[PDB]
Point group: D2
């Protein structure tokens, strides 16, 4: 089911502080290498008046190099697929709620994304587009009550110096009964490699591999 | 702002990947702080979550404001206001909601978007084990030129005990109005009648504003 | 008896804020059935205090609250044995204060033994630069969990320049003898400093409290 | 010196119950590893899970590469102090402080630790914790001082994990060069203990890296 080279198609519908928008994207990736790429276009609600870096982490942990020591919860969910839900709680009070329903049609992954964020102050880095990039992170995934959850508090590097923190609470739910893994980690690094002035066209990348921390 | 007003709404939203839509109609009396409405699920029925979590999303115009406290909401009409709110429950369930309220004569028109995630399948919300929200006293304060509302309240559970939630509301009028100071608004919202699957719901709220202890 | 219309207070708070230790003792009068009390406290070690004094005022009993007969007083029924409480005050900028109080009764006098630790208060924040004026009046909300009473409130301190500095409390009250547990109720507050020095080595503290059952 | 010794004294209270612990141990700062033996000296036997104090018992014990600025080794012989607030998912919050100084080859800790609002049905008060899982801490500069953040968990007895967020602030007594946004991998273990945990042998292994990176 898992081919070494797969395609991505998505459609995000959402709103931030009451401003609705829609974005579509297309891209490629290699699940066994943990790297993926896509290009997204704003289709409704443009130009986006908020920092584009708050949607980048919503735009599939299938793309993660899993060793043979760690159980891959995501590659085992196909061809049925899985869905995840996530809340991102920023330190200044802004919270973004996101959901994604992932299915497989041959070599292409089809996403169904909903993204809503509220309580972003007008003087903050999000509404003032003063974010540069997400810093590298290390997500921690653990199984709780039959589903696997992923938690990490990471940060955005701000234009001028300093960091803007965000606390992620993700829950992954497969559509099919699969074998659940142990407490392990997944390192991330997401970066925007190309965009326009109004971020109407964005090229996003992600690199991820799973590890188990420092050995005992 | 007339003493007897009507309410019309339409909430569209989703919970843990479930989209649904609800419409409602109701009446209220803004200068007395009381309102009532009737809601019908129109999409996504039957609802698989506790109906208690949306009742607080269904306009602080319905609050008895004394004359010593500045009425932020009655000063926004006929232009109106909008509010944004995140509700963070103690077990990890988080709901983000927005409502854009306008006035068409004597009727308030709501346009609500409500999305909640990370609700565990063993929690009171997924098993519909909530009874009612208990009375609350919301705290309203102005921050960075906008009005904010904060309260940590709870839901009474079916077997007994409480389910806590932290509210952070931000109210933004569409026109510049005079800002109030740090005051309170007491609440008491109850579902007075329902239709099994909560496909039909009668919701009531009573609210008064005060400024605390002397 | 047991509780007279006029009760006395003796206490000793030992603690530390950002690693700086201090100790203070106090005495005062109080009318438990009216919900009013008065105090005089003297810093005895670690002066002058380099933090806003409004950070200790809410730690310095809920016996002093005019409870109605319609609501069960969890605290007045715990004497002459007494009770103890724990609290975690979480400020919006990240400063957290943990406090404990063991209250006992010796005739007409209440004996407190308080330990107070606060950490992660930024050097640029209202607490360490003493830009607080007063606590706003609150309204606490008390509920029973595991046979003990809990008190939670989202409150704020007014800043010198204008605006408020928020704090979220989670207090737990535990009586030393089995008592009747109450229903979900509220207690409204108003704490005020009536007099102080320059370095707040001498402070006049007042409290007013009533219990109610919300809006009818 | 590449070979360091340790001596500490933690005084604290958990849920209003006071206790005191002392410890001594070894270390190699340039390898990120350390070992110790601590004895509870007041308030025993402890009625709480011992695994909540182990991480309070100095980032100098972390192997730092040369592309990353070592904020901690760069503060001696004056030293630094740190504060932390670890807040567990069920509501228990612990505030801890440590002031470290150096007397030759020995590190002196002076630790004060208060934890409150720990429920009676919890993994901490029923001593149902087994071990901390390995972690990856995130350290970033804020207002000229160093900060440390981590969202980690404890492995429980019947199964599952117990979550806690650490928010640490390290501030040296000396003007030091501040690093970039980096990480520190951890794995803290107790290799030997008593029945009432009056004697504890603790190990920690820590290395710093720069995120995800034959020859």
């Amino acid at each position: 089911v898992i081919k070494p080279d797969m395609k991505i198609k998505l459609r995000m519908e959402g709103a931030v502080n009451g401003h609705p928008f829609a974005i579509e994207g297309v891209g490629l990736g290699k699940p066994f290498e943990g790297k993926q790429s896509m290009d997204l276009k704003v289709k409704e609600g443009g130009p986006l008046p908020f920092a584009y870096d708050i949607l980048t982490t919503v735009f599939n942990r299938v793309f993660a190099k899993y060793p043979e020591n760690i159980v891959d919860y995501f590659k085992q969910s196909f061809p049925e697929g899985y869905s995840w839900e996530r809340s991102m709680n920023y330190e200044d009070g802004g919270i973004c709620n996101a959901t994604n329903d992932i299915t497989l049609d041959g070599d292409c992954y089809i996403y169904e994304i909903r993204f809503d964020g509220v309580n972003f102050p007008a003087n903050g880095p999000v509404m003032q587009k003063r974010t540069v990039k997400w810093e590298p992170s290390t997500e921690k995934l653990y199984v709780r009550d039959g589903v696997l959850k992923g938690d990490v508090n990471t940060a955005l590097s701000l234009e001028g110096g300093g960091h803007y923190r965000c606390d992620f609470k993700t829950t992954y739910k497969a559509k099919k009964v699969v074998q659940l893994p142990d407490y392990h980690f997944v390192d991330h690094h997401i970066e925007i490699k190309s965009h326009d002035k109004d971020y109407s066209n964005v090229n996003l990348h992600e690199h991820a591999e799973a590890h188990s921390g420092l050995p005992r």
